[PDB]
Amino acid sequence: VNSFSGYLKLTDNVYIKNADIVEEAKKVKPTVVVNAANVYLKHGGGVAGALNKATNNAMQVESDDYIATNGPLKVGGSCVLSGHNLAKHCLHVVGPNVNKGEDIQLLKSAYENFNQHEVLLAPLLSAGIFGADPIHSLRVCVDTVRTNVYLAVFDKNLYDKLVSSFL
Numbered sequence: 592v593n594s595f596s597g598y599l600k601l602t603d604n605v606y607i608k609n610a611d612i613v614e615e616a617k618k619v620k621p622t623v624v625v626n627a628a629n630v631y632l633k634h635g636g637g638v639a640g641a642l643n644k645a646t647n648n649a650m651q652v653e654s655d656d657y658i659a660t661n662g663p664l665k666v667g668g669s670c671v672l673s674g675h676n677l678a679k680h681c682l683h684v685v686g687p688n689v690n691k692g693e694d695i696q697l698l699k700s701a702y703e704n705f706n707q708h709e710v711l712l713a714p715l716l717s718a719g720i721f722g723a724d725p726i727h728s729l730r731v732c733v734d735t736v737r738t739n740v741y742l743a744v745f746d747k748n749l750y751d752k753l754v755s756s757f758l
């Protein structure tokens with residue numbers, strides 16, 4: 592039993608809710624919140640900009656030190672950093688950005704990072720400003736993630752479409 596509330600169950604292990612991931616993180620304090628990161632961990636907009644803003648820029652400060660030490664992530668890769676005031680940990684995952692021409696097949700690799708964590712609060716990878724089709728992203732999520740994932744979808748209109756077109 593966990594503290595996630597109001598989710599619709601899609602499969603054995605995937606759940607979905609119309610929610611602001613920032614507000615959901617602050618209420619649940621999950622062990623892991625997933626960030627929709629880029630390889631430079633520059634949290635300027637979308638989910639990343641919102642999560643970072645909610646940490647009063649502490650996420651960005653920590654991320655800049657991470658990059659200075661380790662260099663950029665790979666597209667499809669991830670790193671675990673602090674969750675600050677939002678979660679115990681933040682899993683920064685880099686989905687492909689279609690608006691940069693990155694290979695959508697890397698989306699499966701990106702979701703594989705979730706399998707290293709038993710339970711996660713997450714957005715749909717490569718959705719929003721990353722330019723992928725959120726319905727495809729949901730399908731890859733369901734077909735790749737085996738651990739328990741609670742998907743927060745900010746846009747109500749999109750949430751309803753994801754539920755209604757879900758196979």
Ligand SMILES: Nc1ncn(Cc2ccc(Cl)cn2)c2ncnc1-2
Pocket residue numbers: 610611612613627637638641642686714715716717718719720721743744745746
């Ligand atoms: N605070 C928030 N802002 C934006 N989105 C949309 C979004 C989804 C996926 C990606 Cl890759 C980029 N952006 C959110 N979903 C849940 N919470 C969100």
